[PDB]
Design a protein around this ligand. Structure first.
Ligand SMILES: CCCCCCCCCCCC(=O)SCCNC(=O)CCNC(=O)[C@H](O)C(C)(C)COP(=O)(O)O
Ligand code: SF4
Ligand code: SF4
Ligand code: FES
Ligand SMILES: [Zn+2]
Lengths: 108, 119, 185, 62, 688, 93
């Protein structure tokens, strides 16, 4: 339905994180069989990829930032659910050094 | 520090670690008016600009080539610092140089030049 | 009704806590209110007998990257019966959510969606709030002063994979910014 | 002909003869279709070159 | 209100501050501060054509007219001194119609050559005409004209478009110090010129380009190259000399178009030297773009970075732990010199010094090689004792301060050294250290003049450090300083003048030559931008590796060559003669396949088999904090800590040879100017 | 005795001290009266003095291979600073 108002405390933020992750999982088979990909990728590893993406922003403290990040998460998920994203965009998107940089360019 | 707004901005992550310079541009020497002072800008160092090998046009691959000049102007140093801090850029503030007004009088043109003492 | 009559009556009739800032000029009567009283103020202006604002013209948005409340959403309104034009504007933020007005004016849905698309200002309890103008998978909000004019990504056709793909931008000729601003102004 | 660039083609036009200290150059005979008027003080013995057209003016007297 | 342009008002007398009403808003200004300056304090910007804040006040062009309640006629705000309780009026019909009336007269005889004027986009005449002017235009008769007379290879003049504001004349008479430009004639038709064939032959003679408001005087090398709006303005510093003058590099794409001085009240004060201004041409001349390898037959063949670095790392192992001498350059930021020093030290050798007069300079207490008195502080000196320095060709922007002090405060100068031409009256005491011995004795009236003069300054040039009796001469000048009491807790008089940009930072990092026998029996020579060190001293079998951006002489005798980056496309820090540390901005991209100096040195270090703690520009700066921490504090005016009493005694006799100049051609000092086309033709007719 | 045998033990002895010197005052008092006497009997030894107002009082030393053995003297005394220089010299040999 409509956009949730806000989260006053971090407990509601964690609850919304869990709800978003659960919804993304319940939507994992439809995106498996709508893009016509069954054997190329198993549904298991997408769960780990989503978990890693969620855990990436672990240092966020502001509840509003958490809410807006979760909203962007639902937006991306809904875009993927519809046959709107380009073919195999998801699989490509969701998968000393000093000398190495020096031999290529000055800007590293 | 505090790059949460940088995280939610949606811009490519590799551009969040750019080093930027914050300064107030000084008055040009070729003009005497001071109607272009007191405004602070963030200076992304868009150094890499090669030359197109068909017509000599200046090509570029840096998305921030002219952002800090054409747009994104701040009315104060604090606003620019807060902006760069919010977007998680490694800023480096450069304080501007201000002219020092000195007592200048027209009569100083015409001095007694002392007394013709032997020397 | 006369522009000054709207000024006087609305300022006297309105609750005092709703309007933080208000302006009268020939350009247009302006009511700068808080972010949370916006819904109530719009509801009052829609239903009151003397001030019957029935149609919402558009929902604008201005980015000021020099103040704490960076964005500023502007609601242009029109009173068809009394032939007046009132303008209500509030201040927003990158993360602050502002109450929607789709319940009052159903036409505001697309304008709120495009404001979210361009400036990234979310709207509370807005049904089906998603990007409307920019393409699918777009990253960043173009109308912010931060967004480069040319953008971050390009579009081309790649032969190894028979589809249209995207790369980081590589301009053949950079946008030449001409600084015409001069002193004595 | 096109082998003569304007660099070496404007130099083959003989300098104009005029009396007085200064002369007004407008380019075309119609002032609106020429360049902005350019008064040049032709006092040196070298011909004075108009900066817009490149036409050279020299003083017949003296 | 706040002052326009952020101008700072210095109240030398808190009690004396007359209060005036600029437009009804009362402000307080000290004694003096002519009506124009009072309005400047109160945030009101007044039109001006003849008034320059750096020159003497002149009253012509009548453009800054304002209305004072107790004045019948409109007064020239740029000349009328402030009085207590004035009611000034700026936005008044009198003070306005005055401005349109004056500017109509200004524009009635101006030529119509705006599309071809090189100052089209930044002309004060048209910018003020749009704001403070009437659009109609009434003049219809024939205008006047003035013929153009050549002067200088680098000052293109079109005197037709010259409002007679006499600003150039006052500049040449006061700041430049050479009187060659003057105003000739009477009435309508007065010209400005030298009246003869002479050209402006002055070191800071290119500043007439900026100071002239209209496009009458414009730079000849930049003739019609570009417009101001299509120029990206970058604020960097200069490396041509050791003054470190602030500049403003203007670039259109990947090349530098022009260099414009930047205001800095403590270093250069809105002026720059010609060598600084016109060295931008060299950055696009013959430059090293790819690494090269010396062949068996002497041919140069470009290779990849991996190949050349592999060759250098293979050859460096074969040599002894000693004989790995590495010489820095005069154009090398502090980070690169630190990386070079660390790299050489980790190889077991300590033969590292700075290009140009670094044989045995102590670099020990930070005042024996520094300009202890601030450059802005030279204006309070009452006597100068220039010792073998000739600061007209080594430091062009210090002679400006010296001449400004001489003409304003009427000081005395006692130049000692080889014969030279000065912009000011100087008393040539002598040519050698015998004159110093006389000064320490008093066999001349100048000893009495120095003893009776408070706040004296003794400037010692860097050339004296090359002499074998560096310690004896330094002890002699120190005894002169102590006996005459020029150094005080409230005023430090003794100071030294360096000549290279990368010299103060080189001495701060502690890289100093220890033995005069180096570069003689040492095989591995790492010439890091040292383009002028005598290559005849290096032995034939040395495998000299050259790291630089311009190759003029060391390139011929060099083995494997690593291209470098100039100062306009790097970031590292440079230090001033007075200990001021300031950074550089990467205005333009690097040409060819070249990297930063410190990056190349660190890559060589890693290839050679030794590991350094740092791998980024931030890591090098942290390392510098442990060797010369003052090089990482940019905006700090830290004074000298200790006095000169800590120096041990030097009992050796001084010398018998008079002082010798160090720079012969002012226009060819570094490889940037030595490879420039404009500088070469400037150093052909402007030599004398 | 030990003062003379420093040049053959290390090279490039660095001393850092603040200008205001809330805690660098002992270091300044050490260096002012124990520099001329040291360098007079220790020729051809670079003993660098770098101030950089707003920095801690370190004391560094570079040996033959470039190894670096900083000694922090923030809260020491002049005899204790001298003994720190002692143990710094002996570690080099
Ligand atoms: C095909 C897939 C479609 C959708 C793709 C979407 C991919 C991106 C997903 C959204 C990315 C986001 O950042 S949206 C969600 C962002 N939310 C957060 O990052 C919460 C911050 N972390 C915490 O609260 C805790 O540390 C926590 C780690 C939760 C637990 O650890 P503990 O309990 O010990 O405390
Ligand atoms: S000096 Fe100014 S007004 Fe005169 S022609 Fe040039 S741009 Fe136009
Ligand atoms: S040449 Fe330039 S500075 Fe000199 S009087 Fe003319 S306009 Fe003024
Ligand atoms: S600017 Fe003051 S009279 Fe010319
Ligand atoms: Zn013509």
């Amino acid at each position: 339905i409509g956009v949730p108002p806000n989260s006053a405390n971090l407990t509601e933020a964690r609850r919304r994180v869990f709800d978003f992750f659960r919804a993304a999982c319940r939507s994992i088979p439809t995106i498996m069989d709508i893009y016509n990909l069954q054997d190329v990728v198993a549904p298991s590893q997408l769960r780990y990829a989503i978990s890693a993406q969620i855990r990436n922003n672990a240092h966020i403290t502001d509840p509003k930032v958490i809410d807006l990040l979760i909203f962007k998460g639902m937006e991306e998920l809904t875009d993927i659910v519809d046959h709107a994203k380009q073919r195999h965009h998801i699989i490509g998107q969701y998968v000393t050094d000093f000398l190495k940089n020096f031999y290529t360019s000055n800007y590293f | 520090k505090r790059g949460e707004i940088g995280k939610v901005s949606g811009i490519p992550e590799e551009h969040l670690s750019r080093k930027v310079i914050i300064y107030s541009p000084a008055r040009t020497a070729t003009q005497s008016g001071s109607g272009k002072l007191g405004k602070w800008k963030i200076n992304f160092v868009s150094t890499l600009k090669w030359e197109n090998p068909l017509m000599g046009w200046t090509s570029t691959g840096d998305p921030y080539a002219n952002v800090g000049d054409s747009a994104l102007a701040f009315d104060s140093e604090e606003a620019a610092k807060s902006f760069a801090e919010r977007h998680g850029w490694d800023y480096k503030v450069k304080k501007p140089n201000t002219p020092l007004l000195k007592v200048k009088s027209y009569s100083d043109n015409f001095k007694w030049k002392g007394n013709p003492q032997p020397e | 009704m006369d522009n000054q009559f709207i000024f006087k009556y609305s300022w006297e009739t309105l609750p005092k806590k709703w309007v933080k800032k208000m302006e009268r000029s020939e350009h247009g009567n302006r009511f700068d209110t808080n972010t949370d009283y916006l819904f109530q103020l719009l509801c009052f202006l829609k239903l009151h007998t003397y001030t019957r604002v029935q149609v919402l013209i558009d929902i604008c948005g201005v980015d000021y990257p020099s103040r704490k409340r960076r964005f500023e959403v502007v609601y242009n309104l029109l009173s068809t019966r009394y032939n007046s034009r009132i303008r209500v504007q509030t201040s927003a933020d990158e993360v602050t959510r502002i109450s929607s007005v789709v319940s009052l004016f159903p036409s505001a849905g697309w304008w709120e969606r495009e404001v979210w698309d361009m400036f990234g200002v979310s709207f509370i309890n807005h049904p089906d709030l998603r990007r409307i103008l920019t393409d699918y998978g777009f990253e960043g909000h173009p109308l912010r002063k931060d967004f480069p004019l040319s953008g971050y990504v390009q579009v081309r056709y790649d032969d190894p994979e028979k589809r249209v793909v995207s790369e980081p931008i590589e301009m053949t000729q950079e946008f030449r910014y001409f600084d015409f601003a001069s002193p004595w102004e | 002909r096109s082998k003569k660039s304007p660099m070496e083609l404007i130099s083959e036009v003989p300098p104009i003869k005029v009396d007085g200290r200064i002369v007004a150059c407008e380019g075309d005979t119609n002032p609106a279709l020429g360049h902005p008027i350019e008064f040049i003080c032709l006092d040196l013995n070298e011909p004075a070159i108009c900066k817009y057209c490149g036409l050279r003016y020299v003083q017949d007297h003296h | 209100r706040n002052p326009v342009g952020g101008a700072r008002v210095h109240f030398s007398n808190p009690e004396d501050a007359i209060e005036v009403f600029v437009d009804g808003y009362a402000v307080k200004v000290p004694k003096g501060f002519t009506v124009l300056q009072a309005c400047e304090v109160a945030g009101v910007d007044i039109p001006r054509f003849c008034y320059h804040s750096r020159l003497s006040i002149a009253g012509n062009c009548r453009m800054c007219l304002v209305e004072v309640e107790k004045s019948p006629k409109p007064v020239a705000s740029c000349a009328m001194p402030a009085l207590p309780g004035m009611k000034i009026k700026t936005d008044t019909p009198i003070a306005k119609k005055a401005r349109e009336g004056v500017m109509e007269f200004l524009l009635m005889n101006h030529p119509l050559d705006c599309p071809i004027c090189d100052q089209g986009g930044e002309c004060d005449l048209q910018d003020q005409s749009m704001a403070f002017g009437s659009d109609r235009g009434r003049f219809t008769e024939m205008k006047r004209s003035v013929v153009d007379k050549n002067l200088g290879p680098l000052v293109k003049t079109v005197m037709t478009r010259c409002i007679q504001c006499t600003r150039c004349v006052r500049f040449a008479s006061e700041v430049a110090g050479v009187q060659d430009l003057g105003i000739l004639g009477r009435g309508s038709g007065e010209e400005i010129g030298t009246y003869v064939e002479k050209l402006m032959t002055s070191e800071l003679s290119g500043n007439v380009i900026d100071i002239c408001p209209v496009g009458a005087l414009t730079s000849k090398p930049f003739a019609f190259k570009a417009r101001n709006w299509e120029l990206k303005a970058t604020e960097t510093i200069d490396v041509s000399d050791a003054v470190g003058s602030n500049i403003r590099v203007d670039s259109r794409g990947p090349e530098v178009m022009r260099i414009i001085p930047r205001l800095n009240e403590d270093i250069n004060e809105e002026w720059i030297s010609d060598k600084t201004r016109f060295c931008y041409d060299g950055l696009k001349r013959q430059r090293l773009s790819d690494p090269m390898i010396r062949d068996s037959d002497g041919r140069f063949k470009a290779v990849s970075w991996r190949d050349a670095l592999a060759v250098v790392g293979d050859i460096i192992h074969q040599v002894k732990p000693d004989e790995i001498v590495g010489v820095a350059g005069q154009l090398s930021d502090a980070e690169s010199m630190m990386v070079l020093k660390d790299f050489v030290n980790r190889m077991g050798s300590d033969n590292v010094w700075c290009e140009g007069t670094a044989a045995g300079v102590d670099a020990d207490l930070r005042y024996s090689y520094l300009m202890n008195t601030s450059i802005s502080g030279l204006e309070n000196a009452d006597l100068f004792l220039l010792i073998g320095t000739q600061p007209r060709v080594e430091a062009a922007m210090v002679n400006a301060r010296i001449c400004k002090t001489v003409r304003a405060s009427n000081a005395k100068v006692g130049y000692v050294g080889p014969p030279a031409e000065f912009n000011y009256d100087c008393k040539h005491l002598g040519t050698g250290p015998d004159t110093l011995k006389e000064i320490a004795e008093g066999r001349h009236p100048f000893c009495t003049a120095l003893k009776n003069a408070k706040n004296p300054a003794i400037i010692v040039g860097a050339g004296l450090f090359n002499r074998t009796d560096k310690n004896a001469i330094l002890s002699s000048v120190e005894s002169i300083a102590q006996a005459n009491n020029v150094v005080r807790p409230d005023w430090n008089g003794l100071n030294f003048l360096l000549q290279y940009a990368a010299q103060a930072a080189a001495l701060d990092l502690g890289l100093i030559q220890q033995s005069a026998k180096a570069l003689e029996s040492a095989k591995f020579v790492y010439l890091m931008g040292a383009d002028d060190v005598n290559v005849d001293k290096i032995p034939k079998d040395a495998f000299v590796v050259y790291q630089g951006h311009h190759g003029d002489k060391a390139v011929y005798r060099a083995n494997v060559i690593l291209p470098a980056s100039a100062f306009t496309e790097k970031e590292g820090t440079y230090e001033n003669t007075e200990g001021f540390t300031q950074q550089t901005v990467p205005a333009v991209p690097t040409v060819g396949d070249a990297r930063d100096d410190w990056k190349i040195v660190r890559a060589l270090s890693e290839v050679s088999g030794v590991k350094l703690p740092y791998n980024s520009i931030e890591g090098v700066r942290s390392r510098i904090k442990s060797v010369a921490p003052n090089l990482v504090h940019t905006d700090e005016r830290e004074p000298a800590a200790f006095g000169p009493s800590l120096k041990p005694e030097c009992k050796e006799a001084m010398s018998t040879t008079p002082f010798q100049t160090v720079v012969e051609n002012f226009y060819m000092t570094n490889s940037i100017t030595r490879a420039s086309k404009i500088m070469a033709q400037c150093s052909a007719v402007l030599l004398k | 005795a030990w003062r003379g045998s420093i040049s053959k033990s290390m090279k490039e002895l660095r001393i850092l001290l603040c200008q205001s010197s809330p805690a660098s005052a002992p270091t300044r008092t050490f260096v002012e009266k124990n520099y001329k006497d040291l360098k007079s009997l220790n020729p051809k030894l670079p003993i660098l003095i770098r101030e950089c107002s707003g920095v801690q009082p370190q004391m560094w030393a570079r040996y033959d291979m470039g190894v670096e053995r900083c000694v922090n003297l923030d809260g020491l005394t002049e005899p204790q600073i001298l003994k720190a220089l002692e143990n710094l010299v002996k570690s080099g040999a």
